[PDB]
Structures are given as C-alpha cells and as structure tokens.
Amino acid sequence: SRTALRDWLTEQLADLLGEPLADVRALADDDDLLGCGLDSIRLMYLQERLRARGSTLDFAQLAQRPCLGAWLDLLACADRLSAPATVALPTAQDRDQPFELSSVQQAYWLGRGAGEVLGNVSCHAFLEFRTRDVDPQRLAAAAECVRQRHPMLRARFLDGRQQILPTPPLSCFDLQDWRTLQVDEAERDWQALRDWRAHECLAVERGQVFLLGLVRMPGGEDRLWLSLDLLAADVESLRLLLAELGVAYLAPERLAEPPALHFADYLAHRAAQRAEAAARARDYWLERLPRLPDAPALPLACAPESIRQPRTRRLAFQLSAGESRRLERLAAQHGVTLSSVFGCAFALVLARWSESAEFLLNVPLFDRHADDPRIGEVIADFTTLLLLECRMQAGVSFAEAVKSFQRNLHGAIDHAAFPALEVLREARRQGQPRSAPVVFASNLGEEGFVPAAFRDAFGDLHDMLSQTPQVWLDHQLYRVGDGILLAWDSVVGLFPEGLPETMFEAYVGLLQRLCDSAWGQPADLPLPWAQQARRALLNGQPACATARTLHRDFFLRAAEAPDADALLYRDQRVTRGELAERALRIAGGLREAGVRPGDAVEVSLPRGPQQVAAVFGVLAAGACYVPLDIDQPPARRRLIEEAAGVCLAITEEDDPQALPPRLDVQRLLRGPALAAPVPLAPQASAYVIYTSGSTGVPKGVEVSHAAAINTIDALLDLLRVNASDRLLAVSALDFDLSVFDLFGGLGAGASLVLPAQEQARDAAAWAEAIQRHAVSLWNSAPALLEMALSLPASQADYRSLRAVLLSGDWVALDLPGRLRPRCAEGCRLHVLGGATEAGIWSNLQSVDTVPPHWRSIPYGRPLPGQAYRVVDTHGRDVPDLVVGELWIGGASLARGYRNDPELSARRFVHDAQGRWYRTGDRGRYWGDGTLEFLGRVDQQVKVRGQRIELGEVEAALCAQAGVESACAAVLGGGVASLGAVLVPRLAPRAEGSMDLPAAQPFAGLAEAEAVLTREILGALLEAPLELDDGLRRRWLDWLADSAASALPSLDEALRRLGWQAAGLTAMGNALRGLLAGEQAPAALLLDPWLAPQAVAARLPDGREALARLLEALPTPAAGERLRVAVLDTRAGLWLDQGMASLLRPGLELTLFERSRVLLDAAATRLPERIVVQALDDGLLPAEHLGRYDRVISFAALHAYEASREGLALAAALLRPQGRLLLVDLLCESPLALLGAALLDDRPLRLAELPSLLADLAAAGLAPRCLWRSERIALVEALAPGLGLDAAALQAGLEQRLPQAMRPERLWCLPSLPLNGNGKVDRRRLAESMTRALG
C-alpha cells in the first residue's frame, strides 16, 4: 500500500540521513532526496534494504529519479513485477582457510607483482597524524588489540587467495623513538622513514597487512602514522580501524565486540547474492567491451610500463567548511550527490588534460551490503570497483555536465556487479588492451574521514598517501575537519614535472568556482592562467610586417639597383633590372590577354628565369598566380584549371583554345612593359598554391599579399636577408617555400640560384650551384637537404651557407648534427612550422643545438604576426603538454580555398580568439611554451617532402575505370615509399542456367573415405592422448559418423581412392608429427599426406577433376604463350599430382598463396621455373592484375572467409575473356574433414554448387559447371571486361597524379579490412604493404 510504503521509506531515510521521521515524511513526492543530503553510499544502503525487503530495484532505477514519489511509483511496480532476491547463502566458511580474493583485492594483488603495468607497489594507504605526547605502550597494545578484534587485519595473501591467520609473525607497530636526536637530524630521518614506509610494500605474504607506527620527535612531538594495505580494507574500513585504534588507545575496555561477520562468510554470501546482477551486468559490459573508452589520455613524461617502482606524490587541497557547505548546497539545489560534483569536476579536468573527452576512471564503490548491521563495523576490503566510462560533454554548463556524469555514474553503479577487473580481463582477452589507471574515491562520510574516537586521541589527518598499483593518479576525497580534503595521489615522474600540480591547481580552481559561482557557468575549464599567459605572449607576437603587395619589394630592389644579380641559373645570370623588365613585359602581355587585378593566372613553366619573370609578371599584372609544376599531369591540371576558375595559363605552349587560354611566356616576353606593377591592395589574392586535396579534387590555397608578406617579413627580419645573400630555390614553384625564395629573397634583393627542371631533385647540381654562386641561404623540405647532405663534405661544400630554413616535413634530430659542420660558421638552422594554408610558414625553432629531450625538432615560437592554438576536438584550447589540433592564426593565414567555400568554412574557422586554420596537425605546447608538432591524425602524409592527401591518391585510383575502392599509405622501411591497395569492381550477373552431368561419382567413394577414416582414426585412437579434447570428441564420434556407420565398405576402399598402405602409414606418422612436433596447426599444409588440398587431389577423385582442370591450357598445341595463375598453392602439394602435364611447354604459370611460408614450402619442392608470388599479409601485388588468361582455385575456396574473397581475387587476376578453373569440396571428404578439424575451421565453409555459382556470377564471371559434381565440382567461368591491368593503372596514375604521389608500389585486396569503427584499416594496410615490400 503506497502510503504505508512512504512511511517505510521515510523511516529508512530518517535513519540514513539522520533527519527526524516527521521531517522526512514532510518531504514531497517530487522533492529531491539528494536535494536533502542523500548520497550514493546511503542510497546503496536504502537499495540494499529494499532488496532485503524483496522490493528489488536497481540503484540506477532509484537514483535516476531520486525522490519519494518516483521511488514509490517504481516500487508499486516492483512489489508485483520485480524478481525476488532469494539466494541460499553459505552460512559459514572455514575461518582459517586460504579463501578467495574479492575482485578488487585480486586487482591490487596482481598489481603488487613486479611485472604488471605500473605494478610493483602495495595499494596501501599511509596516514600521518600529530600530537605532543602519546604512550607507546597504549599504542603497541592498541595495534595488537585491533589485529585480534578484526579478522582481516591479520590476513595473509598468497597465490591469489587470502588467509586470516591466528596471529601474524611480524609486529603491528613501529616505534621510532628519536627524543635522543638533534631536531634537524630527526626531521630528515622522519623524511627517510616517511619516504620508506609510505611507499613500502607491506608484508601481506606474512599477514602484515597493516602497520601502525610512531616516531617520537625530539621537539616533543609524537607523529603517529599508519600504513594499511587496502588489500585488507575499504577506506571506509580504514576509518573503522581508526575508530577502534582510537578507543583501543583511549579506553580499551569500550571495544564492544570483535565484529562477528567473518570476511570469507561475507564474500561467499555477497558473491552469491550479487550473482544474477553480475551475469546481467556482464551482458551489459560485453555489449560495451569493443566500445569502452581507454585510459584518460593524459600527458605522460614516461610510458607507465617504464617506471619500475612507482612512488606516489600526494597533491592535496583542504576545501574549507564554507567551500564544502557551498558545494553541498549547490549539489542539493542541482539534485546531485556531492561525490558526483567531485567526480564530474575531476572528469572535466581529466577530459581537458586528455587527448580524448571519453575515458575510463576506476571508481571504488563502497559495498558494505550484508544483512547483519555489524557489517558496518567489519574491517575487510568491502570496496567494489566500478569501471566508470565517462564521456564528457564539451560546450555545456557544469549543471548539465554534473547531472550527465551523475546519471552516467548512477546508471553504472548496478553494472559494477560485474567487477571492473573482470571487465578489464575480458578486454585483454578480447584484444582490447584497456585500463582505468585514474582512480576516483569519494570518502565523504560526514562523521569525518578520521573518526571522532581517533581525533580525540590524535590530531586530524596531518598527511596521507595512496599506493594503488596499475594506477597513475589516485584521486581520493576525505571529509577533513568538516571541510573536504581533495587528494591526488599522482605517481612520481610518470607525468611531466609541472603537470599533476598544474592540473590539480585547475581542479581546485574548478571546484572553487563551483563553491563560489552558480553551475550555469561552463563545464569547459579555463586553462591554468599561467599557461594561457605564456601562450598569449607567443601568439601575441606583433605583426613584424608592412602590409603591401607581395611583389612591391622586388620592383623596389630592381629600381634601386637594376644591375644587381637577381637570378643565377645554368651558369648564366639575370639582373634585377632585366628580371623586372621581363616581368613587366609579361604583365603587359597579361593585361593585353585580358588578365586583371585579383583574377588568377596559372604558371606552369620549367624551373628557370622565365618562370620567375612570369610569377612576378602575373603579380605585376595584378593577378593571383596559380603555380603548377610543368610535370603536373593533364587530367589533374584540368581539375586545377577548372577549380581555380583561372583566367589564363602561362606554359610555353600557346593554345588560346585550352580549358583556360594557355600562353607562351616567350610571347608574353615580346609584350610591352607596364611602366609599373598594377597597384594591388595588400589583401588581394597573391598566390593560389594547389595543395593536394582529400576528395581527389586538388585544393587551391588562396594567400593574400598581406598574408604571404607577413610570413616573409617576419622571416626576412629574422634571417637578416640582404643584397649579398643568395638563396638556392630548390623549392618547386607549386610548393610554397618557393614564395619565400621568390618574393622574400628578391624582396630583400638577395639573388636566387635556380635549379634547372633537369636539376629538380639533383643534390650534385645543388652542391655545384651552392659552391659556384657561394649560396648563403638554403630553403627546403628537409628531405631535400638530407639529400643534399648525403653528398660528402669533400664533394659538396656548403661553408658559404650562412643560414638554413627547413620546412614542411619532419626534420630529423641529427640533421643539425649533419648540417652545422657542413654549412657556414654562424650556421643558423631554423626549422619552421605551419601549413600551406597559413602563408609560407608559421613557426620557427632556431637550432644552434638540439637539447636531448626533443623527440622531434618542435615547431618553435610562432613566427611574428601569427599564432598557434592547440585545441580539443570541440575547439577549446588544450593545456600545456596535452595533445590537440594545431590551429594556426592571425595575419599570415590564407584567405581560404580558391573555389571551395564549404571546405574553407571547415578549416578557416572563427572564434572569440579571431580566425584560425584548424590544420589537422596534432601537437602540444610544452611547459616552456614551445610547440611540439606530433604528426597528423588524418589521411595527409609527406612523400619526399611534398604534401599528399591519401584520399587524393585513393580518389585518383577510384577514378580508374575498374576500381570499386582504394586505400593508400606511406610505408615503413628506409625507402619511405607511398603504397596503395585496390578493390576491383566485378560487373555482376545472374546465371542459374547450368548443365553439369552430375553422374561421374559413386557412393562407394564416400564410403571408401569413411573406411580410410576408420583406418586412420582406428590407428591414431589407439593413442588419442596425442590429440586435444576437440579432436577426441569429434574423432571418437566420427569413428562411427564419418568412418563406418551408414558407410560400410571393405579395404578395397583404399584401392578405389588410390592411396595404399605406405600412404596410410605416412598419413598417420605425419599427423603424429603435426600433433607432437608443436608446429600446429599450420604444418597440416606442409605434407602431401596431411593437407586438405593434397588428400582431396586423389581421395574424393580430385585427380579426375584435375584431369580436366589441368586441361583448358592450350599453349603447346597452340605453339604460343599462355599466362596462367594458381590461387590455391599452399605448399604446392596438389600441383605435385599433375606436375608433368601441368607444367606444359610454352607456359607461364604463377603460384599465389595468402601466406609466405606455404608458398616457400612449395618453392622448396616444386621446380623453380614456375613463377612464385606471395599474397603477403593478404595482399596481391598489382603488377599481377589483369595479367592471366587462366586462373585456378583448388580444394581451398572454402578456406577463404567468403567464396567472394577468392572469386574477386580471381576476377581481378584474370585478363578479360580469360577463364577461372575452380575445383572445391562441396560434399564432405572424411579425410579433408580430419584436416578441417586440425585447422579447427568450419566444414560449413564447403558450399553448395548453386551457391558457388551465385557468388561467382556476383563476381561477374560467366560460369559453366563442367564435371565431377558433389565430391569435387569443376566450374569454369569466363572474365568480363573488368578493365584493370598493371600498365593501365600505371598509365591512369601517370594521367591523374604527379610523380611525387603515384604509388611506387601498388596492390589489391578482394575487399579492404575494416577497423572496429567500420572504417578502412589504414594502419593494418600500411603494415601489410610494408610486409609486402619485403
């Protein structure tokens, strides 16, 4: 009855809150009980009382609607609709026996071992307290009294089990009386004792789970301190050890009763009583296990595997009684537990310090749930560990975040019934390596953490430590005073030195603005202000530029000294006057050709003075130059000419009827000179560099003169570039480092040494050109300079080279090591950062030397006038050392992409901090404000210094007629090659019209294989212990079901199948060799008596199928070449049964496999004139696509994960109108079924013939089923015009990609592998291609 139930709940709440019964009855039905000071510890008690009343509700059901009315309306359902909690408990377990560990004690125990991830430590709490005088004889009594009073305080831990001893062999109390000492010595010795015993691994293996102790300081001070391994205790149990030590010190007679409910009795009861909720929670965790977030991805100075004996460092902050009150009142007004305030505020900090906002944290629940009320006096480890996934919402108030985090935590509390350790174990077994190495422990009992009976004897908690193993950062909370001690037991040296302090200072700041300001304020933290202060300096670097047309300065340097050498090229030179005139003639020719201000002009000239004159001439016509290599291939050039909206192209070719009108630079050099460059305002489009672009369409990066010249000035004024300098422009014109050579170098009036197009990658030409023109300035991607430095110092003298710019790709840490002894005195290497989209660069790390902690040469300070943010995936700045997305900002940015406003809005984003490029580079601001770049998260990679989007390479391969989809990756090995992988499209058909005469087989052959199974198993089942239990259970039954029952025959079977007693003897012995040699399972495929294809090739009349599959190969009678391939080679063992008439005169035959080792076992025995080709790590080298007039599959199509795998592979491998020849098991071969059992791989793979045909016709091949039917069916099928070939791909790549990004090696898969998100597995494919490089 509902009113009687509200009375019962009122009485439970009046107990659990301690409020009066009448006052609690006066709470309204919708009045929030967390809004009255209910918390989770009380609510699990109330929920346990409801469970004990048979009124079964989950904690989450009560907790998602935490008010009396909602509880009553849940309960009016549950008292008739919900399951009874009735379980037959074990009423006792034998009290001295080595009983099982609780799940969280198993975690601590396994974490105690030296080998485990961040292991080798206790899990102990250490507590320190102060007082003037206390008696050691009271304390030595008190410690041994509490060891005898509570079973768990003397529990030995061995071998994954715990044993309550009679009395432990080792003392409970460490008296350290030092009233003898000098204070300074005792205080340092205290620090030595503190450091030892607060990190000490307690001797739990000898039942010392806890050790009290007391230093007596010569300053007249007793530092009572307490080491307790939480293997023995909940921190709630620890504060009861404190209460009892308090009474046992003060008045030991008042210790009421040794609390009777022994911990083995509790674990037996609790495990059985949780068991259905644990199985229900297990279903929930299994459905989430591939979807768990990881560890909080915090900035680690060391890998957690690599610090061998982790000291905890405590950080702590006593929130005042007033701060606590303000959190408690706001928490109540916002309907949340005080633990959810702290857990949410901590998860916001962890989110803000993580590379991802989704992570686990290990939340130790209280789990004191047993029927005897004295369980709340027992001292065992009643913790149970909740693996809280939390998934912190960015861009919300804290009120929204804490309610979300509470509903998440409260929702997860029932799912803690399956313990966090078994979740993580099941993750490790499922190949999900995950851990929850950040702990969160709310210990908020209002009596105080240190209980009254102990505070009356000793000072309130002076200090403490955790030592939780596997755990980086143990965040406890305690009531201390009636305030709240926040503690972060971070691990020493795991994090960067400033970080846990800085992160905790931001956590305290967060909790204080939660005391002191309403929760409608953002959950998204400020940075720790000092981090934002540093970064606002480094971003705030002043413009350091005069906003002007980009060409202005060169035309000034020309007007100021017309005779000075502007360009040096192929051992001739061009003056600034000559170049300015040549440019202004081009400009006049361009205005004559209808080009006009901020309209755009392609420049596509071989590297040399006419190119430089043309870009200056475009700019001096007022136009935006759109550089492309002359090597840029015609279809790609048409994508760019189309996308750029380009007015004109300059190309040495005259063609006024091209896509843009295309012009001879030599004719534009006949043009009248403009008397000046056209006046452009600084913001006009200056260069549009066509970077590679991920949809396949290349992308024009439209950079204003202001933007370009802000980078250039910021760097000219740093290099101190002057008229005596000369630059080697190894920069290609469509790679925007050239824009600095071009308008920086000549704007300062330094000369440009240009390589010829003949010298575009030629280190020896650069070395000659540098030593010949005494080049002072280098500028490149470091791939080009490492190439230049690979010439010896005797062959390539760079001592003229005053200063060096390295850019746009990873500088190796030893490149300044190679470079400083090679280049000039005053070497001035600068490594520069930032993308095409940001003007020519955006950072500068100078490198006089590399300090050893650089893992890469960082992006330095931002260049003057431009800036970096590093952001979370929600746009807010990440804290220092945290990885986030590099946003380049400020005056240097490109205006956008030339005609892609939507991709521009995706990249050039606007924020309260101005305009930002959102690069997709990852990186982190170090504590010194330097910006370590950390590579890229996305499909964009660097090939020979140049930028490539793998999405472009893939799209340029999908642009092949015949490709369904593609993958690309830059590969491992010293070659650093770009690879790619193809799925062909199959041109499907439906082809059920089939005309196989089925009649050749007879049932006596399946009976004969049954008799041979009776021979082989009848012998090996004299020694069935050679097998495993799966082989035994199958083969003992199959000795009827596949060998004799309903399959009678004589040993004439063997004479019908064709193998005789020497064969059977080798089958039995080779199988014993497979079993007992430890080579399982793969050695099945290395022996002609073992393998499913080798047995099939004679036993099921696979030889009479082979007599037809060995035919359709006309080459010797044709007098002419036939190209043939085999998919199902394995160790070659079926070809060995056709070999002489298989290996026909005139033939090309190629072996393929899907492993190396089996094909190499084929090459070890088959004649080496046959061509050998791995499909290494699944992967077909594309040099074989469309090559073969005949393709073979043989007694292994079942072994492909679909027929559609092998059939698409065959269809790709076949030349058009060439033929597949396919034989496979459809019916059981009883002996191939032994082999299937030894692979332990399903004989359900053996197709029906209609299904084989439907899959094959879906793979587009037109079939005829020929012969040999249900034992082994020979199908041929004939290839459509799939249109792929090696040379056709190479030609289509040569049409659509420059030689920078055509894959130097190319492959195919019948489908791409998916990672666990359902996206293409570019890491597995990068590895697979790397393995396929050999």
- Which residue, 164 or 894, has its beta carbon nearer to ligand AMP? 894
The reply on whether position 207 binds ligand AMP by CB under 6 A is no
- Which partner in Mg ion, ligand AMP, none is near 809 (CB below 5 to 8 A by kind)? ligand AMP
- Which residue, 350 or 857, has its beta carbon nearer to ligand AMP? 857
The reply on whether position 918 binds Mg ion by CB under 5 A is no
Q: What is the 3-class SS of 534-564, one letter each residue?
A: HHHHHHCCCCCCCCCCCCHHHHHHHHHCCCC
Please provide the DSSP assignment of 1066-1103 as one string: HHHHHHHHHHHTS-TTGGGGG-TTT-HHHHHTTTTSHH
- Which residue, 946 or 1229, has its beta carbon nearer to Mg ion? 946
| CA distance to 41, 340, 345, 443, per residue, from 334 (Å) | 19, 11, 14, 21
What is the H or E stretch that residue 99 is in?
strand 99-100
Contact set for ligand AMP, span 675-694 (CB under 6 A)? 691
914: left (phi > 0), else alpha (psi -120 to 50), else beta? left
| CA dihedral over 506, 508, 511, 512, signed as positive or negative | negative
Cα(558)–Cα(546) distance, rounded to whole angstroms?
Answer: 19
Does residue 1183 contact residue 1306 with C-beta atoms inside 8 Å?
Answer: yes
The reply on whether position 835 binds ligand AMP by CB under 6 A is yes
Q: What six digits make up the tokens of 954? A: 């893939």
Cα(456)–Cα(574) distance, rounded to whole angstroms?
Answer: 94
- Which partner in ligand AMP, Mg ion, none is near 919 (CB below 5 to 8 A by kind)? ligand AMP
**Beta-carbon count within 10 A of 850 CB:** 19
The count of chain residues that interact with ligand AMP, using the rule CB under 6 A, is: 15
- Which partner in Mg ion, ligand AMP, none is near 808 (CB below 5 to 8 A by kind)? ligand AMP
- Which residue, 215 or 788, has its beta carbon nearer to ligand AMP? 788
Q: Which stretch binds Mg ion (CB under 5 A): 203-211, 684-692, 722-730, 1269-1277?
A: 684-692
The reply on whether position 239 binds Mg ion by CB under 5 A is no
- Which residue, 241 or 888, has its beta carbon nearer to ligand AMP? 888
Contact set for ligand AMP, span 1010-1029 (CB under 6 A)? none
Query: 3-state DSSP call for residue 992?
Result: coil
What is the H or E stretch that residue 1156 is in?
helix 1156-1163
Report the side by side order of strands in the sheet with 726-728: 572-575, 565-569, 751-753, 726-728, 777-780, 803-807, 829-833, 843-846, 861-862
- Which partner in ligand AMP, Mg ion, none is near 726 (CB below 5 to 8 A by kind)? none
The reply on whether position 939 binds Mg ion by CB under 5 A is no
The reply on whether position 1269 binds ligand AMP by CB under 6 A is no
| CA distance to 411, 439, 472, 1101, per residue, from 475 (Å) | 21, 6, 10, 70
- Which residue, 292 or 934, has its beta carbon nearer to ligand AMP? 934
Instruction: Give least dist CB 876 to ligand AMP, A.
Output: 21
List the Cα angle 1107/1113/1114 in 5-degree steps: 120
Does residue 901 contact residue 915 with C-beta atoms inside 8 Å?
Answer: no
- Which residue, 458 or 887, has its beta carbon nearer to ligand AMP? 887
Residues with Cβ within 8 Å of 134's Cβ and at least 6 positions away in sequence, in order, are: 214, 222, 224, 249, 457, 458
Q: What are phi and psi of 942, to 5 degrees?
A: -110, 125
- Which residue, 781 or 1010, has its beta carbon nearer to ligand AMP? 781
Cα(964)–Cα(951) distance, rounded to whole angstroms?
Answer: 14
Residue 801's identity, in one-letter code, is L
- Which residue, 61 or 780, has its beta carbon nearer to ligand AMP? 780
The residues that bridge with 1253 in the sheet, in sequence order, are none
Q: What six digits make up the tokens of 795? A: 């062959």
Q: What is the 3-class SS of 110-121, one letter each residue?
A: HHHCCCCCCCCC
Instruction: Give least dist CB 933 to ligand AMP, A.
Output: 5
Cα(734)–Cα(636) distance, rounded to whole angstroms?
Answer: 13
The reply on whether position 691 binds Mg ion by CB under 5 A is yes
Contact set for ligand AMP, span 836-895 (CB under 6 A)? 836
The reply on whether position 809 binds ligand AMP by CB under 6 A is yes
Instruction: Give least dist CB 727 to ligand AMP, A.
Output: 18
State which of residues 479, 822, 947, 1271 lies at the interface with Mg ion (CB under 5 A). 947
- Which residue, 941 or 1182, has its beta carbon nearer to ligand AMP? 941
Instruction: Give least dist CB 1248 to ligand AMP, A.
Output: 53
- Which residue, 671 or 923, has its beta carbon nearer to ligand AMP? 923
State which of residues 151, 834, 1132, 1280 lies at the interface with ligand AMP (CB under 6 A). 834
Does residue 227 contact residue 200 with C-beta atoms inside 8 Å?
Answer: yes
Q: In the stretch 757-796, what mask flags binding to ligand AMP with x, by CB under 6 A?
A: ----------------------------------------
State which of residues 106, 337, 807, 1193 lies at the interface with ligand AMP (CB under 6 A). 807
State which of residues 82, 237, 442, 836 lies at the interface with Mg ion (CB under 5 A). 836
Instruction: Give least dist CB 1298 to Mg ion, A.
Output: 15
* Residue 328 CA neighbour count, 13 Å, CB half: 18
Cα(612)–Cα(126) distance, rounded to whole angstroms?
Answer: 73
Q: Which stretch binds ligand AMP (CB under 6 A): 58-66, 100-108, 808-816, 1030-1038?
A: 808-816
Q: Which stretch binds ligand AMP (CB under 6 A): 791-799, 828-836, 979-987, 1021-1029?
A: 828-836
- Which residue, 10 or 919, has its beta carbon nearer to ligand AMP? 919
| CA dihedral over 282, 284, 287, 291, signed as positive or negative | negative
Instruction: Give least dist CB 1297 to ligand AMP, A.
Output: 16
Instruction: Give least dist CB 970 to ligand AMP, A.
Output: 12
Does residue 637 contact residue 628 with C-beta atoms inside 8 Å?
Answer: yes
Cα(886)–Cα(864) distance, rounded to whole angstroms?
Answer: 17
- Which partner in Mg ion, ligand AMP, none is near 1179 (CB below 5 to 8 A by kind)? none
Question: Residue with the closest Cβ to ligand AMP?
Answer: 947
Instruction: Give least dist CB 785 to ligand AMP, A.
Output: 12
Token pair 């004159």 is at which residue? 613
- Which partner in ligand AMP, Mg ion, none is near 155 (CB below 5 to 8 A by kind)? none
Q: Which stretch binds ligand AMP (CB under 6 A): 321-329, 807-815, 1037-1045, 1290-1298?
A: 807-815
Contact set for ligand AMP, span 927-956 (CB under 6 A)? 933, 947
Q: Which stretch binds ligand AMP (CB under 6 A): 6-14, 171-179, 244-252, 804-812?
A: 804-812
- Which residue, 691 or 1193, has its beta carbon nearer to Mg ion? 691
Provide Rg for the chain, Cα atoms.
Answer: 39
- Which residue, 323 or 949, has its beta carbon nearer to ligand AMP? 949
**Beta-carbon count within 10 A of 130 CB:** 16
- Which partner in ligand AMP, Mg ion, none is near 810 (CB below 5 to 8 A by kind)? ligand AMP
- Which residue, 887 or 1152, has its beta carbon nearer to ligand AMP? 887
The reply on whether position 919 binds ligand AMP by CB under 6 A is yes
The reply on whether position 842 binds Mg ion by CB under 5 A is no
- Which residue, 61 or 807, has its beta carbon nearer to ligand AMP? 807
**Beta-carbon count within 10 A of 1246 CB:** 18
Residues with Cβ within 8 Å of 1037's Cβ and at least 6 positions away in sequence, in order, are: none
Instruction: Give least dist CB 1300 to ligand AMP, A.
Output: 12
Residues that bind ligand AMP (CB under 6 A): 691, 807-811, 831, 833-836, 919, 921, 933, 947
Residues that bind Mg ion (CB under 5 A): 691, 835-836, 947
